[PDB]
Design a protein around this motif. Structure first.
Motif, PDB file in Angstrom:
ATOM      1  N   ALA F  73      -0.834   0.406 -12.499  1.00 38.17           N
ATOM      2  CA  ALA F  73       0.389   0.682 -11.930  1.00 38.17           C
ATOM      3  C   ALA F  73       0.276   1.278 -10.348  1.00 38.17           C
ATOM      4  CB  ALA F  73       1.418   2.030 -12.595  1.00 38.17           C
ATOM      5  N   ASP F  74      -0.777   1.551  -9.944  1.00 38.98           N
ATOM      6  CA  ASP F  74      -1.180   1.925  -8.650  1.00 38.98           C
ATOM      7  C   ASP F  74      -1.069   0.694  -7.747  1.00 38.98           C
ATOM      8  OD1 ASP F  74      -1.786   3.837  -6.595  1.00 38.98           O
ATOM      9  OD2 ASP F  74      -3.888   2.991  -6.683  1.00 38.98           O
ATOM     10  N   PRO F  75      -0.371   0.603  -6.738  1.00 37.01           N
ATOM     11  CA  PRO F  75      -0.471  -0.478  -5.968  1.00 37.01           C
ATOM     12  C   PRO F  75      -1.762  -0.715  -5.165  1.00 37.01           C
ATOM     13  CG  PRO F  75       1.642   0.703  -5.482  1.00 37.01           C
ATOM     14  CD  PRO F  75       0.718   1.554  -6.342  1.00 37.01           C
ATOM     15  N   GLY F  76      -2.597   0.386  -4.840  1.00 39.98           N
ATOM     16  CA  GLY F  76      -3.849   0.353  -4.329  1.00 39.98           C
ATOM     17  C   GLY F  76      -4.954  -0.270  -4.954  1.00 39.98           C
ATOM     18  N   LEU F  77      -4.934   0.262  -6.056  1.00 36.20           N
ATOM     19  CA  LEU F  77      -6.084  -0.172  -7.274  1.00 36.20           C
ATOM     20  C   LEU F  77      -5.711  -1.661  -7.709  1.00 36.20           C
ATOM     21  CD1 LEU F  77      -5.990   2.969  -9.326  1.00 36.20           C
ATOM     22  CD2 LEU F  77      -8.285   2.058  -8.307  1.00 36.20           C
ATOM     23  N   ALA F  78      -4.347  -1.897  -7.897  1.00 33.26           N
ATOM     24  CA  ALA F  78      -3.983  -3.437  -8.376  1.00 33.26           C
ATOM     25  C   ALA F  78      -4.065  -4.458  -7.292  1.00 33.26           C
ATOM     26  CB  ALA F  78      -2.473  -3.371  -8.604  1.00 33.26           C
ATOM     27  N   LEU F  79      -3.851  -4.023  -5.776  1.00 32.87           N
ATOM     28  CA  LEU F  79      -4.354  -4.923  -4.739  1.00 32.87           C
ATOM     29  C   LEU F  79      -5.905  -4.814  -4.490  1.00 32.87           C
ATOM     30  CD1 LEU F  79      -1.051  -4.403  -2.532  1.00 32.87           C
ATOM     31  CD2 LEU F  79      -1.832  -6.325  -4.032  1.00 32.87           C
ATOM     32  N   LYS F  80      -6.577  -3.968  -4.798  1.00 33.16           N
ATOM     33  CA  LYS F  80      -7.901  -3.780  -4.590  1.00 33.16           C
ATOM     34  C   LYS F  80      -8.723  -4.606  -5.760  1.00 33.16           C
ATOM     35  CE  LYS F  80     -11.671  -0.868  -2.919  1.00 33.16           C
ATOM     36  NZ  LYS F  80     -12.098   0.570  -2.920  1.00 33.16           N
ATOM     37  N   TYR F  81      -8.281  -4.787  -6.958  1.00 30.75           N
ATOM     38  CA  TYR F  81      -9.058  -5.137  -7.852  1.00 30.75           C
ATOM     39  C   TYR F  81      -8.617  -6.352  -8.542  1.00 30.75           C
ATOM     40  CZ  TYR F  81     -11.748  -0.965  -7.146  1.00 30.75           C
ATOM     41  OH  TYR F  81     -12.533  -0.144  -6.717  1.00 30.75           O
TER      42      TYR F  81
HETATM   43  C1  CLA Z   1       4.340   6.593  -6.297  1.00 30.31           C
HETATM   44  C2  CLA Z   1       3.264   7.629  -5.985  1.00 30.31           C
HETATM   45  C3  CLA Z   1       1.789   7.340  -5.526  1.00 30.31           C
HETATM   46  C4  CLA Z   1       0.718   7.706  -6.220  1.00 30.31           C
HETATM   47  C5  CLA Z   1       0.753   9.055  -7.043  1.00 30.31           C
HETATM   48  C6  CLA Z   1      -0.371   7.208  -5.420  1.00 30.31           C
HETATM   49  C7  CLA Z   1      -1.594   7.544  -5.616  1.00 30.31           C
HETATM   50  C8  CLA Z   1      -2.917   6.872  -5.206  1.00 30.31           C
HETATM   51  N1  CLA Z   1      -3.031   6.007  -4.172  1.00 30.31           N
HETATM   52 MG1  CLA Z   1      -1.182   4.849  -3.701  1.00 30.31          MG
HETATM   53  N2  CLA Z   1       0.501   3.924  -2.804  1.00 30.31           N
HETATM   54  C9  CLA Z   1       1.754   3.891  -3.272  1.00 30.31           C
HETATM   55  C10 CLA Z   1       1.960   5.120  -4.138  1.00 30.31           C
HETATM   56  C11 CLA Z   1       1.383   5.914  -4.825  1.00 30.31           C
HETATM   57  N3  CLA Z   1       0.075   6.184  -4.616  1.00 30.31           N
HETATM   58  C12 CLA Z   1       2.880   3.277  -2.563  1.00 30.31           C
HETATM   59  C13 CLA Z   1       4.152   2.934  -2.780  1.00 30.31           C
HETATM   60  C14 CLA Z   1       1.875   2.237  -1.821  1.00 30.31           C
HETATM   61  C15 CLA Z   1       2.310   1.033  -0.898  1.00 30.31           C
HETATM   62  C16 CLA Z   1       2.509   1.441   0.430  1.00 30.31           C
HETATM   63  C17 CLA Z   1       0.651   2.700  -1.967  1.00 30.31           C
HETATM   64  C18 CLA Z   1      -0.535   1.914  -1.679  1.00 30.31           C
HETATM   65  C19 CLA Z   1      -1.919   2.332  -1.982  1.00 30.31           C
HETATM   66  C20 CLA Z   1      -2.962   2.005  -0.875  1.00 30.31           C
HETATM   67  C21 CLA Z   1      -3.442   0.614  -0.243  1.00 30.31           C
HETATM   68  C22 CLA Z   1      -3.969   2.820  -1.772  1.00 30.31           C
HETATM   69  C23 CLA Z   1      -3.690   3.770  -2.483  1.00 30.31           C
HETATM   70  C24 CLA Z   1      -4.394   4.495  -3.043  1.00 30.31           C
HETATM   71  C25 CLA Z   1      -4.092   5.605  -3.902  1.00 30.31           C
HETATM   72  C26 CLA Z   1      -5.184   6.747  -4.499  1.00 30.31           C
HETATM   73  C27 CLA Z   1      -5.778   7.443  -3.764  1.00 30.31           C
HETATM   74  C28 CLA Z   1      -5.060   7.912  -2.281  1.00 30.31           C
HETATM   75  C29 CLA Z   1      -4.118   9.172  -2.119  1.00 30.31           C
HETATM   76  O1  CLA Z   1      -4.037   9.759  -3.134  1.00 30.31           O
HETATM   77  O2  CLA Z   1      -3.187   8.947  -1.489  1.00 30.31           O
HETATM   78  C30 CLA Z   1      -2.033   8.290  -1.409  1.00 30.31           C
HETATM   79  C31 CLA Z   1      -1.680   6.949  -1.012  1.00 30.31           C
HETATM   80  C32 CLA Z   1      -1.494   6.360   0.229  1.00 30.31           C
HETATM   81  C33 CLA Z   1      -0.956   7.391   1.138  1.00 30.31           C
HETATM   82  C34 CLA Z   1      -1.393   5.013   0.445  1.00 30.31           C
HETATM   83  C35 CLA Z   1      -2.558   4.841   1.598  1.00 30.31           C
HETATM   84  C36 CLA Z   1      -4.033   5.083   0.889  1.00 30.31           C
HETATM   85  C37 CLA Z   1      -4.493   6.249   1.564  1.00 30.31           C
HETATM   86  C38 CLA Z   1      -4.773   6.306   3.050  1.00 30.31           C
HETATM   87  C39 CLA Z   1      -6.007   6.223   0.947  1.00 30.31           C
HETATM   88  C40 CLA Z   1      -6.874   5.139   1.092  1.00 30.31           C
HETATM   89  C41 CLA Z   1      -8.247   5.491   1.722  1.00 30.31           C
HETATM   90  C42 CLA Z   1      -9.586   5.305   0.624  1.00 30.31           C
HETATM   91  C43 CLA Z   1      -9.254   3.690   0.263  1.00 30.31           C
HETATM   92  C44 CLA Z   1      -9.416   6.193  -0.590  1.00 30.31           C
HETATM   93  C45 CLA Z   1     -10.404   5.923  -1.464  1.00 30.31           C
HETATM   94  C46 CLA Z   1     -12.045   6.258  -0.972  1.00 30.31           C
HETATM   95  C47 CLA Z   1     -12.748   5.604  -1.975  1.00 30.31           C
HETATM   96  C48 CLA Z   1     -12.823   5.722  -3.372  1.00 30.31           C
HETATM   97  C49 CLA Z   1     -12.656   3.891  -1.844  1.00 30.31           C
HETATM   98  C50 CLA Z   1      -4.315   7.541  -5.592  1.00 30.31           C
HETATM   99  C51 CLA Z   1      -4.591   7.578  -6.922  1.00 30.31           C
HETATM  100  C52 CLA Z   1      -5.788   4.123  -2.333  1.00 30.31           C
HETATM  101  C53 CLA Z   1      -7.006   3.682  -3.410  1.00 30.31           C
HETATM  102  O3  CLA Z   1      -7.478   4.421  -4.033  1.00 30.31           O
HETATM  103  O4  CLA Z   1      -7.164   2.445  -3.334  1.00 30.31           O
HETATM  104  C54 CLA Z   1      -7.476   1.864  -4.699  1.00 30.31           C
HETATM  105  C55 CLA Z   1      -5.406   2.823  -1.606  1.00 30.31           C
HETATM  106  O5  CLA Z   1      -6.321   2.626  -0.511  1.00 30.31           O
HETATM  107  N4  CLA Z   1      -2.106   3.556  -2.617  1.00 30.31           N
END
Ligand code: CLA
Ligand code: CLA
Ligand code: CLA
Ligand code: CLA
Ligand code: CLA
Ligand code: CLA
Ligand code: CLA
Ligand code: CLA
Ligand SMILES: CCCCCCCCCCCCCCCC(=O)OC[C@H](COP(=O)(O)OC[C@@H](O)CO)OC(=O)CCCCCCCCCCCCCCC
Ligand SMILES: CCCCCCCCCCCCO[C@@H]1O[C@H](CO)[C@@H](O[C@H]2O[C@H](CO)[C@@H](O)[C@H](O)[C@H]2O)[C@H](O)[C@H]1O
Ligand SMILES: CC1=C(C/C=C(\C)CCC[C@H](C)CCC[C@H](C)CCCC(C)C)C(=O)c2ccccc2C1=O
Lengths: 144, 39, 73, 80, 146, 165, 741
Positions: F73-81
């Motif tokens: 359900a996480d958009p980051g993991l879903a779009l990355k893998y």
């Molecule tokens: C509904 C709540 C929710 C929750 C609980 C999470 C939780 C999470 N998200 Mg996320 N996300 C959400 C909504 C949410 N997301 C939405 C609505 C979007 C669309 C805009 C995204 C898009 C998004 C992206 C593109 C990414 C995550 C990622 C992540 C994971 C780590 C980053 C983080 O904690 O900061 C909160 C997340 C954000 C502030 C979004 C920006 C990503 C930040 C800047 C971290 C990215 C840096 C890097 C990839 C971290 C991993 C290092 C290494 C392990 C590779 C984490 C489990 C990261 C990940 O693990 O990739 C697989 C990742 O890159 N999310």
């Protein structure tokens, strides 16, 4: 108009008896007596259950509460177009006239009636309960 | 005929026809595309 | 006093049971935990708590009970 | 006994008095409305609290209110 | 109830050495009803049977006790005042018209419980039955299994 | 991969579950003939099971220790893998259809509110107006954004009834 | 005085104009909706014909046409059952092996994986195992092919079309007058003689000419294809003469009073058929012949247009004793002018008859291969019992409706009804005391047994080994019925049923019927049944007697039959209406009937149903009823926990659907608790907040959303409670009885 006096020697409607009549409250606390005048012999429904026959002329009945007397009054007024009246009788023999209190039914305005429990404001103008707190007892803001 | 169409336009008849159409569409989609879990 | 020696294989005892309605099978059924009569196996965890804070003998629990009764009064 | 109160928003329609099953309310002369009448509660010791008067009131909000107070033989509607 | 059910089932599968049971049966409600409620209550309901009884019979009695209190609460929760007040009035008449018994009178007039009192009484029975039933089941299942 | 899971194409429990389902279906089929209706129905069910397992493995789903697919359900993991088809695309699809229905209903209410008896139109649905609004609701996101930007989407606080606090 | 056909021509014009105007039947609902409450009212007063108008003629016409619509619906349902048995069933295969092939008449389409519900019922067929017993009924009627069932389905559709045409014709073209409906003497004469007697005679003719020879050849081992067609049996006397020698003499012994010659197909065998396990069809045919003659005689009692006959008014007026005052005076006018009083009487007797049908059907199985089909027997008993209980509660409801609306004190001065209402306090008080006595002496025995068993004192329980409570009266009656064919029934070859005593009858290795012994557990459950029935009677009777007035509210009749309360005054007058008494009576009826069906299921699976082995009979539960039904723990563990295994592990099989319903039924029932324990004030305020959110986005509907009324909340809660509980028991019973029976 003058307050009427109860006549204990008044004939009662023809009824065979029932189990919904008077109880120990009539002999220890109080009871009610309703009297009315009927233009002819007619079968009516008793508020305590059953069908009785009101005789031509005076009719007297006893009930345990005022609601039964008023229910019979409503039935006699709406169906047979009569004018009944009731009293509250105590075991000592005291009789208190109850309705119509001033000789005129309360649904129609009559002169001489003094208004009671009337608030010269609306509901929205009532104060908050905090202003009524720590009074003599549980008091609502509408009581002031 | 106007009164009959007005009767058919009532809420229960319209709801019945609409739900039958929606259910039929979903059933036909699941029939031609069996077991759809992911896009 | 026996639970502190083997707190892994010994069940704690809450209090004794004195009920004239119990028949004989109920009497030997509730007689467990090393007691001489029918007792209740405690589930509140006061044994582990008292053992951890320093209680070791029944004298300590007796003194604590008297002290708490005085505090209550 | 229950507390029955009449407010100035009363229009004097006499519907609350006709709906009272224990003769608690009545009509008194007044000048604050077109009907020139106002509801009154001079026999609150006989009120049971059925709130039929509130059901019969047409004003918004209600002009008659019943607050359940102390309970007695009359207020509880006990025939025994 | 949901949080304690989840806690007890996850810990029961953990202590039993089979977490896969919870992992594969917690995704559907039938697994919750069969693998957790029906399976873990076998020793509880066997506290006393026609062949005898064991030390776990008190929890079986408490289990049925809680079920009875809960069901008794449903009475105050579903039926309301009016019916009971009319019934009590008939009982008052029966006592007043019975010889050798009308010589003994009540000091307070018998009346049905008020609406607020009825709600409180029904909720108290519901909560007591709820607590006693779950406490008996949890203690009996956890103690009998281990 | 994600959360310590393994792909369903490599999970042993996944293939074991497929074999178990095919085994019970084949066991039930062993009691019938070879050219009868139950035999054909059971063979069709077996082919559907094989196709479903192959399609789920081909989709790249992740299976746990139980051999069942797990959604991301996480958009980051879903779009990355490559798991956006599980929870992301269906999310936007539902949002589009749900907003479609809500917008069409709101438009119908606003349209019939300016008539003589709106309640009559609420119980007896005006089919031509409803069909026209249903067809015009395809541009619901653009129309909704425009209504929100113009300030006509919401009602003023002074025109909404509230309790006396 | 003259019984004739009084009909008005074209009273109502057939048009669709009123179809577009909802609520036209009511003066208040014809204005239109303003709030959502109106919608519910539109359905709550649709069939309240006496509320739409005060004209008795219009109400009677509406009732008569509604009856035709109901008969059309029933005909459509029956036609559907015959069509399903003719096109989607395995009846033809089941005929050649009724002891191994499971009856099935429903097939599901292969969609979303639901094809698993098409279980292997046998005979090279896949489907859902039915428990309605249509296969046994069709086998008893002599049906051997799907063509006959298809023809019956087409005939049922034709009959349904005729019923709907009759309703339309009698409401819009030729509507009967009020005097036509008030001909109770003529109606009773026709219903007794014509309907019942002629139906029994016609069915006896079919049984004598079709059921008896076809079933005789079927029991003899002849293949259904080789058995002659019914018309072939009805066309020549040679085949019937070979099967029944008395047919060689024709109808001559019937007219010459030589009825004894027809003893080959009209017997008094009794017992059951050892080949099929059901009642002898010769006995059923002779039964229908006697029933037809008796009903035909009964249909010539009332006076219609000639001097002979009886006047029910005269009979009712002639019955008057010194302890009842006037007597039945005014009862004839009450039953000829009030439809609710007639509905109350008819519903009470109809429900009682349905319960009697359930008992007689399990005890004396009348269809071939019915007793061994444990699923069908359990389902039939439970279904008929539930229908009977529901009809009884409805009888109480309509009695209260009559007392509130059609009661008139001017016609009941000193009659039986007047005196009953006069001493209603004594009646209710004594019934209350007997209910408390029964509750203590019935439930306290189980509580005492549970306590003694838990305290390790089984010698102090109320069981067979310990202090016993044997039903000596029931045992004596059983012995009397078992010994009846030797002294008090010289012409009866065997007893009416095998439940009284004797040897057991088994078909296909399964016990069809065996004696049922009664012990302490049976005594306790019988007293439990008596207590529950008494409480249900107490609630319904209290709601009927105190429907017009009481010591709390003296003018209840003015408030109507269905009203929520009379305010929080007088301490609280919640649920004082007769409707609320029916609402509580529904719960008590559910409780009573649930314990009844539970007792039936456990008793049948423990001491009757089971397999037959070498020198011994093994039951389904191993005879644990006598040892475990004396405690609540036994019912919870050995009956509820042990037998629910089949429904909880049914997933992945053909009975998985039952398991799903078993869970769904637990939901609906719990859902009921939301409506029964809450009040509409909270929901109205919550709706106010939701309406605020709607007004903010301009999506507030014109029809103001209102919470359900107090009466509607109670109705929804009781409906969901009954549906959830009955569906739970249905899923549990069907899954268990299909998997192990
Ligand atoms: C509904 C709540 C929710 C929750 C609980 C999470 C939780 C999470 N998200 Mg996320 N996300 C959400 C909504 C949410 N997301 C939405 C609505 C979007 C669309 C805009 C995204 C898009 C998004 C992206 C593109 C990414 C995550 C990622 C992540 C994971 C780590 C980053 C983080 O904690 O900061 C909160 C997340 C954000 C502030 C979004 C920006 C990503 C930040 C800047 C971290 C990215 C840096 C890097 C990839 C971290 C991993 C290092 C290494 C392990 C590779 C984490 C489990 C990261 C990940 O693990 O990739 C697989 C990742 O890159 N999310
Ligand atoms: C809110 C809870 C919920 C959710 C999220 C789902 C979701 C799903 N269910 Mg399920 N189900 C539910 C509740 C739910 N269900 C309940 C309560 C029941 C009991 C009645 C069922 C019983 C059920 C069955 C029996 C089946 C499913 C199936 C499915 C899958 C079908 C997808 C599909 O329809 O194809 C795609 C649909 C479309 C493309 C329609 C799109 C709409 C328009 C035409 C296009 C607009 C888009 C832009 C899907 C993942 C099926 C399955 O295969 O499971 C994997 C199936 O067999 N469900
Ligand atoms: C197509 C022919 C036809 C037409 C045009 C009419 C027209 C009319 N009828 Mg009429 N009627 C007909 C056939 C017809 N009827 C038949 C066949 C019967 C016998 C049942 C009747 C018996 C009848 C009665 C007793 C009454 C009318 C009345 C009326 C008038 C208003 C009521 C109305 O129709 O609202 C529409 C009503 C409906 C659409 C309800 C239909 C209910 C059907 C019969 C039952 C459906 C069962 C359902 C499938 C099972 C429920 C399960 C659920 C899950 C679906 C109206 C002018 C009423 C009247 O004149 O008012 C004074 C009156 O009381 N009719
Ligand atoms: C021998 C004559 C006869 C017969 C067989 C019937 C039969 C029936 N009547 Mg009827 N009735 C009769 C005489 C008869 N009546 C007379 C003389 C009067 C006037 C005093 C009435 C007044 C009357 C009323 C007021 C009602 C009935 C009703 C019924 C039905 C009850 C439903 C049921 O449970 O039965 C079982 C169901 C069946 C057996 C279905 C088969 C139906 C077939 C067509 C047999 C009906 C025969 C009947 C005489 C019609 C033939 C007349 C012809 C012009 C078509 C039933 C079919 C109820 C009704 O209206 O139902 C619609 C009802 O309300 N009857
Ligand atoms: C409603 C019940 C019913 C019916 C319909 C029948 C019907 C029949 N039974 Mg039967 N039976 C019954 C009950 C019934 N039974 C019962 C209860 C018993 C037990 C006592 C018996 C015992 C019994 C025996 C022992 C026998 C029969 C036999 C018969 C058949 C011939 C009857 C006969 O001998 O001449 C009777 C003559 C008439 C009934 C007159 C016929 C009237 C016709 C149809 C008038 C048509 C006129 C019309 C205008 C023609 C114009 C046509 C047009 C197209 C131009 C016959 C089909 C015999 C048989 O089947 O042989 C194997 C036979 O042996 N029955
Ligand atoms: C021969 C049977 C019969 C007949 C003709 C009537 C006729 C009547 N009844 Mg009555 N009643 C009956 C049996 C009968 N009843 C039984 C067996 C009971 C016990 C349950 C009752 C209890 C009863 C009460 C308490 C009341 C009536 C009322 C009425 C009158 C108004 C019509 C109505 O109910 O509104 C319309 C009918 C409906 C809206 C039907 C409701 C639909 C139900 C809730 C569905 C049941 C669930 C269904 C079986 C499962 C479906 C599954 C679902 C998922 C789809 C009417 C004259 C009312 C009255 O007299 O008004 C003052 C009144 O309140 N009846
Ligand atoms: C399991 C829950 C429960 C219980 C125990 C009861 C119990 C009772 N109901 Mg009831 N009811 C219930 C659920 C329940 N109901 C629900 C959910 C509803 C809503 C539909 C109703 C609606 C209802 C109605 C409408 C009526 C009743 C009535 C009654 C009374 C019947 C008289 C009787 O049975 O004699 C004996 C009492 C019992 C069997 C209860 C158990 C008593 C135990 C076994 C005795 C223990 C004694 C022990 C020594 C006490 C010592 C305590 C110690 C601390 C000192 C009875 C007290 C009827 C009534 O008023 O009475 C005539 C009545 O009209 N109920
Ligand atoms: C209401 C059902 C019921 C019944 C019939 C019994 C019966 C019995 N219990 Mg029991 N019990 C019950 C409920 C019941 N219990 C419940 C609900 C519980 C749980 C709280 C228990 C818990 C319990 C325990 C712990 C024990 C018993 C025991 C006993 C036995 C002796 C009790 C005794 O001597 O008291 C004395 C009885 C009386 C003083 C009154 C007798 C009643 C008279 C006959 C009624 C008079 C009416 C009369 C006909 C009116 C005449 C009118 C006019 C002609 C004058 C006895 C057979 C004991 C036992 O173990 O058995 C060996 C025991 O220790 N019970
Ligand atoms: C059983 C006794 C039947 C009693 C019986 O029918 O006796 C017979 C007696 C005689 O009645 P009548 O001679 O007046 O009857 C003539 C007319 O009713 C038409 O037959 O009926 C009554 O006494 C009515 C009073 C009710 C009787 C009150 C007893 C209440 C007990 C109820 C529970 C019983 C257990
Ligand atoms: C009560 C009247 C309403 C119900 C009507 C029932 C009549 C049904 C119509 C079908 C009639 C069949 O009726 C049939 O009559 C023929 C007449 O040849 C009888 O036939 C038998 O007897 C005749 C002599 O009487 C022989 O010549 C014939 O070979 C033999 O089969 C059958 O035994 C009987 O079954
Ligand atoms: C939940 C609850 C409510 C609220 C229940 C409501 C508002 C009923 C809800 C029924 C439906 C959902 C209302 C809307 C029906 C529409 C026709 C549905 C249209 C939707 C389309 C998909 C067809 C009460 O009003 C109430 C009153 C008295 C005692 C208890 C309760 C109670 O428990």
């Amino acid at each position: 108009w003058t307050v009427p006096t109860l006549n204990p020697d008044t004939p009662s409607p023809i009824f065979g008896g029932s189990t919904g009549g008077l109880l120990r409250k009539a002999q220890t606390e109080e009871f009610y007596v309703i009297t009315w005048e009927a233009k002819k012999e007619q079968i009516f429904e008793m508020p305590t259950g059953g069908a009785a026959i009101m005789r031509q002329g005076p009719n007297l009945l006893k009930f345990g509460k005022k609601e039964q007397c008023l229910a019979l009054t409503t039935q006699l007024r709406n169906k047979f177009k009569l004018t009944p009246c009731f009293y509250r009788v105590f075991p000592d023999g005291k009789v208190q006239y109850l309705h119509p209190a001033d000789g005129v039914y309360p649904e129609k305005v009559n002169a001489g009636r003094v208004g009671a429990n009337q608030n010269m404001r609306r509901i929205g103008q009532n104060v908050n309960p905090i202003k009524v707190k720590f009074s003599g007892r549980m008091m609502s803001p509408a009581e002031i | 005929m106007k009164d009959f169409t007005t009767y058919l336009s009532t809420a229960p008849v319209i709801a019945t026809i609409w739900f039958t159409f929606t259910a039929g569409l979903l059933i036909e989609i699941n029939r031609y595309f069996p077991d759809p879990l992911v896009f | 006093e026996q639970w502190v020696t083997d707190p892994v294989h010994i069940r704690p005892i809450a209090h004794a049971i004195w009920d004239p309605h119990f028949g004989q099978p109920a009497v030997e059924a509730f007689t467990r935990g090393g007691a001489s009569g029918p007792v209740n196996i405690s589930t509140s965890g006061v044994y582990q708590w008292w053992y951890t804070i320093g209680m070791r003998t029944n004298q300590d629990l007796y003194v604590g009970s008297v002290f708490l009764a005085l505090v209550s009064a | 006994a229950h507390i029955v109160k009449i407010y100035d928003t009363c229009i004097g329609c006499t519907q609350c008095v006709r709906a009272c099953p224990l003769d608690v309310l009545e009509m008194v002369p007044w000048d604050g409305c077109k009907a020139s009448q106002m509801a009154s509660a001079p026999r609150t010791e006989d009120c049971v609290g059925c709130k039929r008067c509130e059901t019969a009131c047409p004003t918004d909000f209600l002009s008659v209110r019943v607050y359940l107070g102390s309970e007695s033989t009359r207020s509880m509607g006990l025939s025994y | 109830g949901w949080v304690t059910f989840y806690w007890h089932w996850k810990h029961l599968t953990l202590w039993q050495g089979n977490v896969a049971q919870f992992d594969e049966s917690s995704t559907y409600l039938m697994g919750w009803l069969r693998d957790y409620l029906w399976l873990n209550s076998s020793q509880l309901i066997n506290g006393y049977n026609p062949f005898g009884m064991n030390s776990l019979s008190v929890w079986a009695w408490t289990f049925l006790f809680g079920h009875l209190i809960y069901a008794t609460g449903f009475m105050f929760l579903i039926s309301w005042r009016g019916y009971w007040q009319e019934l009590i009035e008939t009982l008052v008449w029966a006592h007043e018209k019975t010889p050798l018994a009308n010589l003994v009178y009540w000091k307070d007039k018998p009346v049905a419980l008020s609406i607020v009192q009825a709600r409180l009484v029904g909720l108290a029975h519901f909560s007591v039955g709820y607590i006693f039933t779950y406490a008996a089941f949890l203690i009996a299942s956890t103690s009998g299994r281990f | 991969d994600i959360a310590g899971l393994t792909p369903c194409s490599e999970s042993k429990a996944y293939a074991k579950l497929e074999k178990k389902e095919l085994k019970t279906l084949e066991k039930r089929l062993k009691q019938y003939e070879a050219d009868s209706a139950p035999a054909v129905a059971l063979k069709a069910t077996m082919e559907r099971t094989k196709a479903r397992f192959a399609n789920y493995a081909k989709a790249g789903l992740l299976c746990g220790n139980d051999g069942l697919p797990h959604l991301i359900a996480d958009p980051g993991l879903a779009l990355k893998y490559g798991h956006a088809g599980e929870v992301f695309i269906p999310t936007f699809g539902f949002l589009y259809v749900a907003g479609y229905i809500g917008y069409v209903g709101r438009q119908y209410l606003i349209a019939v509110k300016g008539e003589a008896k709106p309640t009559d139109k609420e119980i007896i649905i005006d089919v031509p107006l409803a069909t026209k609004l249903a067809w015009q609701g395809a541009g619901w996101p653009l129309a909704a954004v425009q209504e929100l930007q113009r300030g006509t989407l919401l009602e003023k606080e002074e025109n909404i009834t509230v309790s006396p606090r | 005085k003259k019984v004739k056909i009084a009909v008005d021509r074209n009273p109502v014009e057939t048009s669709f104009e009123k179809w577009a105007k909802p609520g036209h039947f009511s003066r208040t609902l014809s204005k239109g909706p303003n709030t959502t409450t109106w919608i519910w009212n539109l359905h709550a007063d649709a069939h309240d014909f006496d509320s739409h108008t005060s004209d008795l003629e219009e109400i009677s016409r509406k009732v008569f046409s509604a009856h035709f619509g109901q008969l059309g619906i029933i005909f459509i349902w029956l036609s559907g059952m015959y069509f399903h048995g003719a096109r989607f069933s395995n009846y033809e295969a089941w005929l050649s092996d009724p002891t191994h092939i499971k009856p099935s008449a429903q097939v599901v389409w292969p969609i979303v994986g639901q094809e698993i519900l098409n279980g292997d019922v046998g005979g090279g067929f896949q489907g859902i195992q039915i428990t309605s017993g249509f296969f046994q009924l069709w086998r008893a009627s002599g049906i051997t092919s799907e063509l006959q069932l298809y023809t019956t389905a087409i005939g049922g559709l034709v009959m349904a079309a005729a019923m709907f045409f009759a309703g339309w014709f009698h409401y819009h073209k030729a509507a009967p007058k009020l005097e036509w409906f008030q001909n109770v003497e003529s109606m009773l004469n026709h219903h007794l003689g014509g309907l019942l007697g002629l139906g029994s005679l016609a069915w006896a003719g079919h049984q004598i000419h079709v059921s008896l020879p076809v079933n005789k050849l079927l029991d003899a081992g002849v293949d259904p294809k080789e058995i002659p067609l019914p018309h072939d049996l009805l066309l020549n006397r040679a085949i019937m003469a070979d099967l029944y020698p008395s047919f060689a003499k024709g109808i001559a012994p019937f007219f010459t009073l030589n009825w004894s010659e027809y003893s080959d197909f009209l017997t008094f065998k009794g017992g059951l058929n050892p080949v099929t396990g059901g009642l002898w069809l010769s006995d059923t045919a002779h039964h229908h012949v006697a029933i037809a003659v008796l009903f035909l005689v009964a249909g010539h009692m009332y006076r219609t247009n000639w001097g002979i006959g009886h006047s029910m008014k005269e009979i009712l007026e002639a019955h008057r004793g010194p302890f009842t005052g006037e007597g039945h005076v005014g009862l004839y006018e009450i039953l000829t002018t009030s439809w609710h009083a007639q509905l109350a009487i008819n519903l009470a007797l109809f429900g009682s008859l349905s319960i009697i049908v359930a008992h007689h059907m399990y005890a004396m199985p009348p269809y071939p291969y019915l007793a061994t089909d444990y699923g069908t027997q359990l389902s039939l008993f439970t279904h008929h019992t539930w229908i009977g209980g529901f009809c009884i509660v409805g009888a109480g409801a309509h009695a209260a409706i009559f007392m509130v609306r059609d009661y008139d004190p001017t016609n009941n001065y000193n009659n039986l009804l007047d005196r009953v209402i006069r001493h209603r306090d004594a009646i209710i008080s004594h019934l209350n005391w007997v209910c408390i006595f029964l509750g203590f002496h019935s439930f306290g025995l189980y509580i005492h047994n549970d306590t003694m068993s838990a305290l390790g004192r089984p010698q102090d329980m109320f069981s067979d080994t310990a202090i016993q409570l044997q039903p000596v009266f029931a045992q004596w009656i059983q012995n009397t019925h078992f010994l009846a064919p030797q002294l008090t029934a010289p012409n009866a070859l065997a007893a009416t049923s095998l439940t009284w005593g004797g040897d057991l009858v088994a078909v296909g290795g399964k016990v069809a019927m065996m004696p049922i012994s009664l012990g302490t557990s049976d005594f306790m459950v019988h007293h439990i049944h008596a207590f529950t029935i008494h409480v249900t009677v107490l609630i319904l009777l209290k709601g009927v007697l105190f429907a017009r007035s009481s010591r709390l509210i003296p003018d209840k009749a003015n408030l109507g039959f269905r009203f929520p309360c009379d305010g929080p005054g007088r301490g609280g007058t919640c649920q004082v209406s007769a409707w609320d008494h029916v609402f509580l009576g529904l719960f008590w009826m559910y409780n009573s009937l649930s314990i009844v069906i539970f007792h039936f299921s456990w008793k049948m699976q423990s001491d009757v149903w089971g397999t037959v082995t070498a020198s011994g009979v093994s039951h389904i539960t191993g005879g644990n009823f006598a040892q475990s039904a004396n405690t609540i723990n036994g019912w919870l563990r050995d009956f509820l926990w042990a037998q629910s295994s089949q429904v909880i592990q049914s997933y992945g099989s053909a009975l998985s659907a039952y398991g799903l319903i078993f869970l769904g039924a637990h939901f609906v029932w719990a859902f009921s608790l939301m409506f029964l324990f809450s009040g509409r004030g909270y929901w109205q305020e919550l709706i106010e907040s939701i309406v605020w959110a709607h007004n903010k986005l301009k999506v507030a509907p014109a029809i103001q959303p209102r919470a359900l009324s107090i009466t509607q909340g109670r109705a929804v809660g009781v409906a969901h409670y009954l549906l959830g509980g009955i569906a739970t028991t249905w899923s549990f019973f069907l899954a268990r009885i299909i998997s192990v029976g």
